[PDB]
Amino acid sequence: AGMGLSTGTARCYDWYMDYLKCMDERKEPMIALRREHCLEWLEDYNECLHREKERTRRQVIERERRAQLAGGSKPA
Amino acid sequence: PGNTVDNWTELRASWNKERASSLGTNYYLNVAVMGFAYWLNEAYYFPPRTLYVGALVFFALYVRKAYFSTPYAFKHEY
Amino acid sequence: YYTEGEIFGTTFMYTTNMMFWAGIVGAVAFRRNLIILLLSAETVMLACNMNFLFTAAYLNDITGAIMSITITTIAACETAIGLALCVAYFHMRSATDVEALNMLK
Amino acid sequence: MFFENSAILLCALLSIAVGYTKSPFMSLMYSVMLFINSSFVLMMLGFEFLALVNLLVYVGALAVLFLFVIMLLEIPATELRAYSRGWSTLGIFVFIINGVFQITPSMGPRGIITGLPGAESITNLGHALYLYFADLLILNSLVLTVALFGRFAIAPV
Amino acid sequence: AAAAAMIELDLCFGLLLLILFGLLSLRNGHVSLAHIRFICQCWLVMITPLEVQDFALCILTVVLLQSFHSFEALLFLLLAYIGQLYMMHSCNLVSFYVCLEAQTLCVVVLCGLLARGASTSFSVEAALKFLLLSAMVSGMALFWFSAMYQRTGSLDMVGQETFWILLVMLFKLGVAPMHMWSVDLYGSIPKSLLLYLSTAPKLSLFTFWASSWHHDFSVGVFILFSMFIGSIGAYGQPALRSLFAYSTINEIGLLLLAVETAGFHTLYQHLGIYIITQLLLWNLTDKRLFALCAVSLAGLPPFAGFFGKAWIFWHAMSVQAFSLLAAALFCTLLSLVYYLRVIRLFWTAPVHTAASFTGAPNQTTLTSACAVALAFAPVMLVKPFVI
Amino acid sequence: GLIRNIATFATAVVGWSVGIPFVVQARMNGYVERNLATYDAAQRQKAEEAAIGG
Amino acid sequence: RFEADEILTVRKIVHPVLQAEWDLRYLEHLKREREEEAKVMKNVPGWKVGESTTRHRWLAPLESWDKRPLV
Amino acid sequence: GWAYSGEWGMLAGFCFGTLKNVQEGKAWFRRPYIHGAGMIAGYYLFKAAADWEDEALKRIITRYERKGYAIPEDRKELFAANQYK
Amino acid sequence: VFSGAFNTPSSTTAREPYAKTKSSEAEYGVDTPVPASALKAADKHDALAYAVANAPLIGLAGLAAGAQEAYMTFERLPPTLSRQHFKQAQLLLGIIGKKTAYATLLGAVFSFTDATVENMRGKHDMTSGMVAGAVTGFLFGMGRPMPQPVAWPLAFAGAAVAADFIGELMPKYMKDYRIYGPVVHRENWGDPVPPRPPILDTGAAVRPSDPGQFWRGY
Amino acid sequence: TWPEPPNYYEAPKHGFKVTLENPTFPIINPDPNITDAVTNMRSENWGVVAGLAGLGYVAGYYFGAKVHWAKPTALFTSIFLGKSGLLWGMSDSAHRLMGFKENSKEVAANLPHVMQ
Numbered sequence A: 001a002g003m004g005l006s007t008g009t010a011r012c013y014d015w016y017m018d019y020l021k022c023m024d025e026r027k028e029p030m031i032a033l034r035r036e037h038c039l040e041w042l043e044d045y046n047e048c049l050h051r052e053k054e055r056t057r058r059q060v061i062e063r064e065r066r067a068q069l070a071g072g073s074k075p076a
Numbered sequence B: 001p002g003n004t005v006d007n008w009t010e011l012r013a014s015w016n017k018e019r020a021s022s023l024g025t026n027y028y029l030n031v032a033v034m035g036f037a038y039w040l041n042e043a044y045y046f047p048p049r050t051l052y053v054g055a056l057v058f059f060a061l062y063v064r065k066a067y068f069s070t071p072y073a074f075k076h077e078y
Numbered sequence C: 001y002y003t004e005g006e007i008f009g010t011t012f013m014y015t016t017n018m019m020f021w022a023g024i025v026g027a028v029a030f031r032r033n034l035i036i037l038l039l040s041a042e043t044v045m046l047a048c049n050m051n052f053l054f055t056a057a058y059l060n061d062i063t064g065a066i067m068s069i070t071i072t073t074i075a076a077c078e079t080a081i082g083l084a085l086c087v088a089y090f091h092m093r094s095a096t097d098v099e100a101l102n103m104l105k
Numbered sequence D: 001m002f003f004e005n006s007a008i009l010l011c012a013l014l015s016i017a018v019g020y021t022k023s024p025f026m027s028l029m030y031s032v033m034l035f036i037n038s039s040f041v042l043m044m045l046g047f048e049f050l051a052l053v054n055l056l057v058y059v060g061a062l063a064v065l066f067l068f069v070i071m072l073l074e075i076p077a078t079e080l081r082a083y084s085r086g087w088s089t090l091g092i093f094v095f096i097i098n099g100v101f102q103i104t105p106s107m108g109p110r111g112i113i114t115g116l117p118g119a120e121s122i123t124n125l126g127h128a129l130y131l132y133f134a135d136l137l138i139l140n141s142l143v144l145t146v147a148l149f150g151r152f153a154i155a156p157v
Numbered sequence E: 001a002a003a004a005a006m007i008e009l010d011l012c013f014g015l016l017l018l019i020l021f022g023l024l025s026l027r028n029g030h031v032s033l034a035h036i037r038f039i040c041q042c043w044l045v046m047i048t049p050l051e052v053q054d055f056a057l058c059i060l061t062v063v064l065l066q067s068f069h070s071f072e073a074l075l076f077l078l079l080a081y082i083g084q085l086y087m088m089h090s091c092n093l094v095s096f097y098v099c100l101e102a103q104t105l106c107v108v109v110l111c112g113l114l115a116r117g118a119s120t121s122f123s124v125e126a127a128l129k130f131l132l133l134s135a136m137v138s139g140m141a142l143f144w145f146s147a148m149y150q151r152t153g154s155l156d157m158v159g160q161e162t163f164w165i166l167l168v169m170l171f172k173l174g175v176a177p178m179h180m181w182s183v184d185l186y187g188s189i190p191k192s193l194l195l196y197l198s199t200a201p202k203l204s205l206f207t208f209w210a211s212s213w214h215h216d217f218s219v220g221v222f223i224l225f226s227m228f229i230g231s232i233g234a235y236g237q238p239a240l241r242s243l244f245a246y247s248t249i250n251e252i253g254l255l256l257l258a259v260e261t262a263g264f265h266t267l268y269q270h271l272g273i274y275i276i277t278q279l280l281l282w283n284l285t286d287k288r289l290f291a292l293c294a295v296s297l298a299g300l301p302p303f304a305g306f307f308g309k310a311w312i313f314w315h316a317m318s319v320q321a322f323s324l325l326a327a328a329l330f331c332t333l334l335s336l337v338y339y340l341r342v343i344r345l346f347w348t349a350p351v352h353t354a355a356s357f358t359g360a361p362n363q364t365t366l367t368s369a370c371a372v373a374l375a376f377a378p379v380m381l382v383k384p385f386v387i
Numbered sequence F: 001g002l003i004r005n006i007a008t009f010a011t012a013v014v015g016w017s018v019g020i021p022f023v024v025q026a027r028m029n030g031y032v033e034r035n036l037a038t039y040d041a042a043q044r045q046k047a048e049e050a051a052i053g054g
Numbered sequence G: 001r002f003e004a005d006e007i008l009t010v011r012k013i014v015h016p017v018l019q020a021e022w023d024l025r026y027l028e029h030l031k032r033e034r035e036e037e038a039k040v041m042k043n044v045p046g047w048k049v050g051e052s053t054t055r056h057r058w059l060a061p062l063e064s065w066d067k068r069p070l071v
Numbered sequence H: 001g002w003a004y005s006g007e008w009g010m011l012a013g014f015c016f017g018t019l020k021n022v023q024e025g026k027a028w029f030r031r032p033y034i035h036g037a038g039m040i041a042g043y044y045l046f047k048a049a050a051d052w053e054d055e056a057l058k059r060i061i062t063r064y065e066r067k068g069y070a071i072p073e074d075r076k077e078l079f080a081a082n083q084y085k
Numbered sequence I: 001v002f003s004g005a006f007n008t009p010s011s012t013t014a015r016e017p018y019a020k021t022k023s024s025e026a027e028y029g030v031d032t033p034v035p036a037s038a039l040k041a042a043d044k045h046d047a048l049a050y051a052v053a054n055a056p057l058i059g060l061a062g063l064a065a066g067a068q069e070a071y072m073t074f075e076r077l078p079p080t081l082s083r084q085h086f087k088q089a090q091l092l093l094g095i096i097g098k099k100t101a102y103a104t105l106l107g108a109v110f111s112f113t114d115a116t117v118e119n120m121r122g123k124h125d126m127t128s129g130m131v132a133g134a135v136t137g138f139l140f141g142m143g144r145p146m147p148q149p150v151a152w153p154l155a156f157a158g159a160a161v162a163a164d165f166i167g168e169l170m171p172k173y174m175k176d177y178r179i180y181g182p183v184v185h186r187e188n189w190g191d192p193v194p195p196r197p198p199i200l201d202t203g204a205a206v207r208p209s210d211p212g213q214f215w216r217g218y
Numbered sequence J: 001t002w003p004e005p006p007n008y009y010e011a012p013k014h015g016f017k018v019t020l021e022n023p024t025f026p027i028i029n030p031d032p033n034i035t036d037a038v039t040n041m042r043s044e045n046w047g048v049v050a051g052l053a054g055l056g057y058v059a060g061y062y063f064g065a066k067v068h069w070a071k072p073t074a075l076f077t078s079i080f081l082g083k084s085g086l087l088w089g090m091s092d093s094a095h096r097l098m099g100f101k102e103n104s105k106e107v108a109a110n111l112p113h114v115m116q
């Protein structure tokens, strides 16, 4: 259920295990209360999964590159 | 009350037609629930006057499935 | 703004979403027979199977392949039983219905 | 990558085409084309064995049963109100809203994903099926047993 | 080491031996199979773990098997029991899907197989409609499981996609407005499968819900739909099969009110009393006891149905679910009218009960007379018992 | 006729293979635009919280 | 079995050399990408060149040279 | 559990036998061995229910005290008791 | 206890108000957050924005009833009418659209009249709901024979009154209701104090109106 | 990036049901075979096997006599219940050998040179 398709484990299995270890070591009587204290590991696991923030950074660099070529077309 | 011939013609009215199978109604109900019932998720937090008036509005505009008939069943053009 | 792999992935997901809703709705919408309804159910199963295999490749994970094999098994068993029931009902009701396998008429 | 993306997009066209036509034979032919094309799509993702399973089961076995049932049970009634009654506009509206515009997509808030090819290992699949998911394997066998017994009990005598 | 899995190997070995024994018995031309049924009941006891819910399901299925006579029907009921038992232990959507689909296929095949007389084609028709409606719900479950699996990367059942899985579960309980497959099934399929369908799968699915399910949503509109639609439908339908189908929709609305306000103890108490009443309802030969089912399904005070409804009402009032409670009380006031129609039909009438001619003389008087003693269970129900 | 049906199928396949990528491209462009708006709003909130949070 | 065991041993010998070569090439490509980003975003206020997204674990690229579509 | 649960079970068994006779058209006293078997089963069933009463109270107090709900010793005897009320 | 002379609880009352009862060792609530659309929909200070926030939900009911009636009309269509797809689409969309627009109109009239009387009277009470119900029901009942132009304002006002009593006034009156721990104003009876309110995994229609009633979540 | 060189000839040592415990008793054998499980089985296990077989024989004789097939029904029902009991007893013995159940009787009998 966490077994890899061509490798031993999945590519983001260890990030998931970090998150579950954080959830294991908290002592709050509710899962919803424990989740508020492990949000950094859940965020890193989601970044392993889909890379939304790396894609966002590349989109911002592309917006600046498209801005420095339309507004700026300076000839020598 | 009334006349026997006129009452029996009233009893016969709008039933001279083959009844449809129920598979279409059931499939359309399941499609409506599985596709659009998530639109009511935030409605549980709305004010209760709005929810009660909406429930009364749904009751007032409901059309009953049993003994239902349309004039469109027996006309040859729109 | 986006790469060729992102076009490929978004095209796959858009295709499978339209496949799923085509299989769910279309044969009922076009008022077709029970045989075509079972074929469209197979289209629904194919869309889910393609989604599971895409995700299994996407995560490098085995669970999508297990689900793929299971979906093929369950879909074929349900389809075979449904076709047998269709044949039995047709032979039971053809003397008075003619269009017996069409319940959307 | 024009032909690969076109082959991906062809599956949705064939999915609509299965229900669009009035001939049951042509519906089955569209389904066979769809399953062959999808087996070639699955092999873009790196799956060699599972694409062959798709072909062998659905086209090789199940569509033969479909064609036997259609050819045994379908006297031509395409004129007999299959053309003269048309289709449902409410159902077409539901299909447009949910599958063209896709107001409730499976990716949810995300709108872009990077497609990644895999590398199928059948040793990993054999290990998983016969060690880690062995109870699911046996329960799949029990479902196939239900299918075999139930068909032979329901066969019209 | 596989030493912790001997019950699974025992399940498989028992199935392998039972098929061969059933084959050998049929090669002799035996027209009755009580020995096969006893071996099936022994196999049911031998594969069930030592929990309360597991043994409740086991004893229920042992009692149900006395109304089935062919070898194939017994095999289908055993393989449906495997899905019903293992769904209570399912902690994923993989096993959830497989158990639900095994149960659906078994029910479809049994509906096809057991019909007789002029009602054969009606039963096959309703089985086909149920199969088609079940296929698309299974597709919805698979599609949204694939969505959840892609989003989370794991097999955890969290997030927005659990709303559609919840709708799948509500379909399997016949919750209005997805209720009409059960209404179609009640009108044509014979009484033994109707008895099977109203008891065992509801227990299995509610135990899965109690054991391994959380969602961040509500089911209140389906509570309202089930209670109002079931009560008004049972008030308006003159056929008795449709009366009991709509009254079942009303009861599942009450069970959903118990689920929605938490407090599963009232859910389990009402479900147990309902299951015992169902076991009485579908095995009745004397029609005077049809009035006891009526007074104990209307919630009338000294009988056990009152207690099952009244803890649901008490826990709903405890957490202040006022609007759903008011709707439940209105529909309870409506339900009394058609249960009184039942009492008018079968109590204020001359008594006629035909004798048996080909043996088997009134063959389920033991179970029906034992289940009528739901007038003595209320002494244990008033105590803190079900928690 | 057979030639008409083959021509209609070929036309439908080519039209689907040219028209749908524009739908997908428009959808992806809308997602990119909304994501960039979300990034700018997040940066604005971060600057505000740095301004009154020390 | 003897042939497979020999090939597995040789692959175990060669694997760290190849992973090291991959690592050095990846580092050089990252250096070129950071130079390009610094050339593009020099005038943007508040932008930091080289901001890693995750906090603890290194993130490999999603795509790789060895996984290609068959057809 | 309840002190008079076995007598209630015996009355349940007698009513069971009488109803099994009435359903099959026999008078109430016919087949008294059916009444006797029903009485034995009813006695043991209601004694088992009365045992589950004490068991449920013990489970509730044990779970509540492990969660941190400290019950005073004047009230722990309401739960951790095989009370024959 | 019981005598024919008098009823002692009718004259045995407290002489002072009580202090607040401590029910648990932790006195902070736990709950899931409300979505912002419903938070905005509660605001009545802008009558127009209140009607705009509330009317689409009441229009959803007419959409559901219209879709029902449209399917039931479509099923009865003969083939000579059903194959004409543009005419079929305009008939069914006419039925659905008329129902949706009528429901949205009734909802907007109710919400605007409610918030207008609210802002005009300067206070929140049950009069604004009764007046809004009378106006909306008179709009529904116009043009009909005569029990109805009186009967429909009464029905819509009764729906408003039931909404106030069940959904607002009774939860406000029972904010100090406790099912656990010490009996309120009877702490001398000695019922023990739990470490927390009870954790219940209830649905979204059953949420704690006070932080001390229960903890909601999982 | 560069994957691990796969070992085709080594399968993982995994049983599909995992116990999620550590043993709380001394471990005699972490992995006993069927001979080890039978040769350290207690007498109560054999007693419940024989009781199940006898009950199966009697009940099978009762039910098989209605179709005049009583002896083979009795034999089959006896074997069916007896193998259920035997699997139960072997599992109990193996769990005592592995340390998950109390094995004071088993530690003083299965270690002839490690007796005391």
Ligand SMILES: CCCCCCCCCCCCCCCCCC(=O)O[C@@H](COC(=O)CCCCCCCCCCCCCCC)COP(=O)(O)OC[C@H](O)CO
Pocket (backbone or CB within 6 Å): D134, D135, D136, D138, D139, E001, E002, E003, E005, E008, E009, E011, E012, E013, E082, E086, J031, J032, J033, J034, J083, J086
């Ligand atoms: C007429 C029927 C009579 C039945 C009873 C008599 C027959 C004997 C019973 C069968 C053998 C005993 C039961 C299983 C023994 C397992 C104990 C064990 O460790 O044995 C071997 C364990 O190997 C097996 O044979 C494992 C059996 C696997 C069975 C897998 C399927 C289980 C059932 C799944 C069903 C799923 C659930 C279905 C419903 C959802 C290996 O022994 P070892 O570890 O000492 O040897 C080490 C060596 O290098 C090899 O490992």
Ligand SMILES: CCCCCCCCCCCCCCCCCCCC(=O)O[C@H](COC(=O)CCCCCCCCCCCCCC)COP(=O)(O)OCCN
Pocket (backbone or CB within 6 Å): B039, B042, D103, D109, F038, I056, I059, I060, I063, I100, I104
């Ligand atoms: C005439 C009838 C014919 C049929 C017409 C069909 C209607 C059109 C189809 C639906 C179109 C609207 C649905 C999409 C709304 C998107 C809202 C913004 C999305 C967003 O980012 O916020 C979300 C919260 O919004 C939410 O919670 C959105 C809830 C909206 C509910 C659906 C729309 C209202 C119901 C339909 C209209 C009825 C009107 C009747 C006149 C998720 O938040 P996140 O932080 O996770 O987002 C993560 C990404 N940044």
